[PDB]
Design a protein around this ligand. Structure first.
Ligand SMILES: C[As](C)(=O)[O-]
Ligand SMILES: [Ca+2]
Ligand SMILES: [Ca+2]
Ligand SMILES: [Ca+2]
Ligand SMILES: [Zn+2]
Length: 360
């Protein structure tokens, strides 16, 4: 027998719950971040593309003009329409109608660890504060994101990351500047939506995120969907966020159109999700139960109903790893798949937020 065990608390900051007893070539200097030390530093870049919606600034001398033009055209022709039609629009704090794409070798510890940063967006750039470039800008890595041969960097490897970062930018605009609350979306769902935009751009599933899900020990032993593990196994959060937003896409009667509704909802993140579920999934289904159903769907993948992804083949290789010993506690929206071949009774002293759901 197997059971999906979930902490149904939707407060990401909630407590541990007990599971029970048993001109071209112009120059500009930008602030960048040395991610080995988190110190600000200065990077001078050259303008290599000046298009309708994007300016491509280059500060890696191995990148050619044609490569920079390819990046700019991809943004103007494909990324910007995708994001504006399905997610939102950027701020324009510098009043120029465009966004900056700074293409350079993001500084990190890849040489020592093999882990690298591909790109990022920093909301401080939208304000008059220390380190700000006072512009819509996102930062795109060259080496090793485009490959490990600096003589043959493949710029098209970064294109889906363009969508990822632009989603962060327009999400920030809506929630920080266009809404009274000026409160960011909860990071787990902001990242989810960035990864949804990557899948839309690629017209293909993010198989590396699924592979990571399938091999993650932290996920198998209860990693939280909503508590973002900044200091620990952050890749597990990326994988859970991605699968959740794809689950919502498949469960929603308006599919990908739900993404912009989540961003533009004036409520907090859980309110936005609850509204989407009530309007597009089931008017009597709570967010907490929808999230439990998500965990069940990863296991069963039923070709119809709440316990799957509507048979979408993009998700057929997802395989939750069962465990034999349930952790003593689970974080909010942390879940495990428990299997036993002996008789099993749900503990009567489990915390009320812990739900046991028999699979098979
Ligand atoms: C790829 As990122 C650092 O914008 O989540
Ligand atoms: Ca601008
Ligand atoms: Ca780099
Ligand atoms: Ca909002
Ligand atoms: Zn992101």
């Amino acid at each position: 027998a197997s059971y999906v065990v979930n902490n149904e608390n939707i407060d990401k900051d909630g407590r541990q719950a007990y599971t029970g007893s048993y001109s071209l070539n112009d120059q500009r200097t930008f602030t960048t971040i040395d991610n080995r030390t988190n110190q600000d530093e200065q990077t001078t870049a050259t303008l290599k593309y000046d298009g309708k919606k994007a300016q491509v600034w280059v500060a890696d001398q191995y990148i050619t003009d044609k490569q920079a033009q390819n990046i700019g055209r991809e943004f103007d022709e494909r990324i910007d329409p995708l994001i504006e039609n399905n997610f939102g629009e950027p701020s324009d704090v510098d009043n120029n109608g465009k966004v900056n794409i700074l293409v350079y070798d993001i500084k990190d510890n890849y040489d020592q660890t093999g882990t690298y940063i591909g790109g990022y967006f920093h909301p401080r750039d939208l304000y008059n504060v220390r380190g700000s470039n006072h512009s819509e800008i996102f930062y795109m890595d060259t080496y090793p994101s485009m490959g490990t041969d600096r003589q043959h960097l493949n710029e098209s490897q970064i294109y889906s990351t363009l969508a990822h970062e632009y989603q962060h930018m327009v999400n920030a605009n809506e929630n920080l500047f266009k809404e009274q609350s000026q409160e960011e979306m909860d990071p787990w769902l902001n990242e989810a939506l960035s990864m949804a935009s990557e899948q839309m751009y690629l017209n293909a599933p993010l198989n590396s995120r699924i592979d990571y899900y399938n091999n993650s020990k932290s996920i198998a032993y209860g990693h939280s969907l909503i508590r973002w593990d900044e200091q620990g196994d952050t890749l597990s959060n990326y994988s859970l966020s991605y699968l959740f937003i794809e689950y919502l896409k498949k469960q929603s009667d308006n599919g990908e159109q739900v993404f912009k509704e989540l961003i533009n909802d004036p409520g907090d993140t859980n309110t936005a999700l609850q509204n989407a579920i009530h309007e597009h999934v089931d008017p009597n289904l709570s967010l907490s139960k929808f999230m439990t159903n998500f965990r069940i769907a990863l296991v069963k993948k039923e070709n119809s109903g709440p316990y799957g992804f509507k048979g979408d083949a993009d998700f057929n290789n997802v395989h939750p790893q069962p465990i034999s010993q349930i952790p003593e506690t689970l974080a909010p929206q942390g879940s495990v798949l428990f299997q036993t071949n002996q008789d099993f009774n749900v503990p009567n002293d489990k915390d009320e937020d812990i739900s046991y759901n028999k699979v098979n």
